[PDB]
Amino acid sequence: DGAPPIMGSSVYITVELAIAVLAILGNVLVCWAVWLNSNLQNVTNYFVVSLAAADILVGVLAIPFAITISTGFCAACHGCLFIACFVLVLAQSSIFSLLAIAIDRYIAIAIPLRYNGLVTGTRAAGIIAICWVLSFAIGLTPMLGWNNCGQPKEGKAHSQGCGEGQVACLFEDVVPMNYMVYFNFFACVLVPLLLMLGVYLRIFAAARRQLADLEDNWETLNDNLKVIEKADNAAQVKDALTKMRAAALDAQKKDFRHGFDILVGQIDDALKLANEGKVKEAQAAAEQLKTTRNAYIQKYLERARSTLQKEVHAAKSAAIIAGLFALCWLPLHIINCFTFFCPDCSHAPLWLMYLAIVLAHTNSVVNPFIYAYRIREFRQTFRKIIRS
Numbered sequence: 001d002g003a004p005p006i007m008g009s010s011v012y013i014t015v016e017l018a019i020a021v022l023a024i025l026g027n028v029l030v031c032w033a034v035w036l037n038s039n040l041q042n043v044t045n046y047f048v049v050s051l052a053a054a055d056i057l058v059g060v061l062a063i064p065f066a067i068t069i070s071t072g073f074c075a076a077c078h079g080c081l082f083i084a085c086f087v088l089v090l091a092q093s094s095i096f097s098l099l100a101i102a103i104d105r106y107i108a109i110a111i112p113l114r115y116n117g118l119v120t121g122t123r124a125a126g127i128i129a130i131c132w133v134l135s136f137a138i139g140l141t142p143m144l145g146w147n148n149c150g151q152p153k154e155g156k157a158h159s160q161g162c163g164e165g166q167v168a169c170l171f172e173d174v175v176p177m178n179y180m181v182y183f184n185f186f187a188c189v190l191v192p193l194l195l196m197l198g199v200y201l202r203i204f205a206a207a208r209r210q211l212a213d214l215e216d217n218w219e220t221l222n223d224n225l226k227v228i229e230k231a232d233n234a235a236q237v238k239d240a241l242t243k244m245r246a247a248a249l250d251a252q253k254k255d256f257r258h259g260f261d262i263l264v265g266q267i268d269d270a271l272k273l274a275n276e277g278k279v280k281e282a283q284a285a286a287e288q289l290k291t292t293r294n295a296y297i298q299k300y301l302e303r304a305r306s307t308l309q310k311e312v313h314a315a316k317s318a319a320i321i322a323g324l325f326a327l328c329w330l331p332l333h334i335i336n337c338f339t340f341f342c343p344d345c346s347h348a349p350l351w352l353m354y355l356a357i358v359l360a361h362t363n364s365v366v367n368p369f370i371y372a373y374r375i376r377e378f379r380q381t382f383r384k385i386i387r388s
């Protein structure tokens with residue numbers, strides 16, 4: 001009752017080739033956009049390009065390799081091992097790029113004053129090169145001896161007419177499942193993804209605190225102004241002014257500096273009048289602070305808030321990319337856990353394996369769409385490339 005295998009194979013192969021074309025076209029566009037637009041040439045987007053390069057190689061190499069290993073063709077076992085393991089290199093490189101992007105965004109939100117001195121393009125290129133070497137080491141670890149080539153399935157090889165030293169080339173026949181679950185999934189995929197989640201939680205928590213701090217200093221500026229107006233002695237004016245002077249410097253950490261120079265100076269003017277017991281003169285001097293607040297301080301408040309909201313928006317776009325990676329790759333890893341941990345369970349059917357593989361490959365298509373829909377500089381650059 002077995003339908004011809006070439007029928008179901010043709011559907012799987014046709015879908016894979018369609019995904020490969022789309023993965024190449026979209027991510028080549030990403031690389032072409034960063035190359036052309038200097039506004040897109042930053043450390044964050046160098047890891048984006050490294051991530052796009054991995055997705056280009058999914059369509060050029062990993063998908064042709066996946067098509068090849070689905071046939072079970074006769075091959076030298078270590079040759080079969082290489083084409084089976086190469087996708088692990090690309091997946092690992094993607095994980096390193098995703099983790100670097102999250103860390104890069106955390107440095108920008110937590111220590112922006114020393115970000116440009118710490119995170120440079122030259123150091124980013126060196127990190128990218130190191131992560132690619134580690135991705136080959138991790139993904140090709142089975143070629144170092146942790147494989148099933150020492151125990152070939154000779155009955156399957158003889159039935160397919162394979163020569164001596166050859167095996168029917170199938171992923172689960174050469175790559176050990178304990179490597180795939182413990183080493184690749186748990187250690188090399190799950191742990192970095194959980195680290196990324198922790199980094200993004202710290203990014204959004206840091207942004208929420210900084211936006212709260214901005215609003216607290218703005219309220220303290222306006223509350224103590226009311227305290228001075230309804231004060232009854234010079235000591236009460238002095239108490240409210242001392243809190244404003246420290247909060248003004250706390251919020252200060254050309255037109256920006258001039259606005260705060262006026263503010264602290266006007267606070268000092270009113271403070272000197274308060275220390276001399278001149279309540280009415282100190283209150284009138286403190287009323288001049290409202291002119292500085294409307295013309296300078298509120299504009300800084302708004303611009304600083306706008307910058308934080310743009311960093312939140314960019315961190316969400318990056319987190320969506322990392323989340324979609326997890327969504328597309330987790331089914332394959334969960335299936336391997338069932339194969340490995342439940343030998344009394346029937347193996348997941350072949351059609352489900354193909355579907356899980358196609359889903360993982362589709363992740364190499366989605367990133368250019370996230371950039372186009374969420375990052376205006378990419379979207380506008382994409383339009384210029386396509387129109388021209």
Ligand SMILES: CC(C)CCC[C@@H](C)[C@H]1CC[C@H]2[C@@H]3CC=C4C[C@@H](O)CC[C@]4(C)[C@H]3CC[C@]12C
Binds near residue numbers: 074076079082083
């Ligand atoms: C620079 C880039 C484009 C070169 C890509 C080289 C690829 C296509 C080459 C490099 C090593 C090759 C493999 C090496 C060994 C074997 C064992 C043999 O029994 C069947 C073919 C097989 C499995 C080869 C398939 C093709 C292969 C994967």
Ligand SMILES: CC(C)CCC[C@@H](C)[C@H]1CC[C@H]2[C@@H]3CC=C4C[C@@H](O)CC[C@]4(C)[C@H]3CC[C@]12C
Binds near residue numbers: 077078079
């Ligand atoms: C870009 C260039 C420098 C990459 C060079 C990669 C070369 C050195 C590597 C990549 C994969 C390797 C092959 C992978 C598997 C096998 C099958 C084994 O039964 C004999 C060796 C053979 C055929 C290897 C020979 C060396 C090989 C071809």
Ligand SMILES: CC(C)CCC[C@@H](C)[C@H]1CC[C@H]2[C@@H]3CC=C4C[C@@H](O)CC[C@]4(C)[C@H]3CC[C@]12C
Binds near residue numbers: 326330331345346348
């Ligand atoms: C949100 C996403 C990541 C969740 C993905 C859940 C998927 C991968 C899970 C949900 C139910 C699972 C299946 C439940 C039962 C069986 C029967 C067993 O004999 C083989 C595995 C198999 C076929 C499982 C394979 C993996 C599976 C399809």
Ligand SMILES: CC(C)CCC[C@@H](C)[C@H]1CC[C@H]2[C@@H]3CC=C4C[C@@H](O)CC[C@]4(C)[C@H]3CC[C@]12C
Binds near residue numbers: 330333337
């Ligand atoms: C998504 C992140 C946060 C966690 C990943 C959850 C993974 C590791 C969990 C979710 C569901 C789990 C499976 C659920 C059911 C079974 C059947 C049992 O007979 C053996 C273990 C096995 C196969 C589990 C292995 C581990 C498993 C795949």
Ligand SMILES: CCCCCCCC/C=C\CCCCCCCC(=O)OC[C@H](O)CO
Binds near residue numbers: 061073074075
């Ligand atoms: C610009 C592109 C850059 C470079 C692009 C390279 C693309 C690689 C394509 C296919 C690899 C498939 C290779 C595996 C084919 C094996 C078939 C085979 O070997 O069959 C005889 C064997 O002895 C069984 O009995």
Ligand SMILES: CCCCCCCC/C=C\CCCCCCCC(=O)OC[C@H](O)CO
Binds near residue numbers: 123130137138
């Ligand atoms: C699975 C196999 C795992 C392999 C386990 C061992 C791998 C080595 C690990 C890291 C090397 C880190 C790179 C060190 C290269 C030198 C960097 C450097 O010189 O730069 C300092 C710089 O001045 C500051 O910006």
Ligand SMILES: Nc1nnc(-c2ccc(O)c(Cl)c2)c(-c2ccccc2)n1
Binds near residue numbers: 088091333
């Ligand atoms: N049992 C099993 N079978 N096939 C693959 C496989 C092979 C080639 C590919 O191109 C892709 Cl995407 C998947 C994986 C597998 C699972 C997780 C990570 C890497 C490979 N696991």
Ligand SMILES: CCCCCCCC/C=C\CCCCCCCC(=O)O
Binds near residue numbers: 010014021
């Ligand atoms: C708008 C961009 C258009 C790009 C065209 C890409 C379309 C890809 C469609 C199908 C790929 C496979 C075609 C033939 C597969 C043969 C099936 C088989 O024999 O296994």
Ligand SMILES: CCCCCCCC/C=C\CCCCCCCC(=O)O
Binds near residue numbers: 064067068
């Ligand atoms: C831009 C360069 C892209 C590379 C082009 C490769 C496209 C070919 C697609 C799939 C390769 C199929 C491998 C053949 C399977 C072997 C079948 C068998 O021998 O039994």
Ligand SMILES: CCCCCCCC/C=C\CCCCCCCC(=O)O
Binds near residue numbers: 127
């Ligand atoms: C078989 C490999 C296993 C060990 C992995 C070694 C780690 C990577 C080794 C060399 C990477 C070379 C590039 C280093 C330059 C650093 C530049 C910089 O950080 O500023």
Ligand SMILES: [Cl-]
Binds near residue numbers: 374375376377
């Ligand atoms: Cl935007």
Ligand code: NA
Binds near residue numbers: 051055091094363364
């Ligand atoms: Na990827």
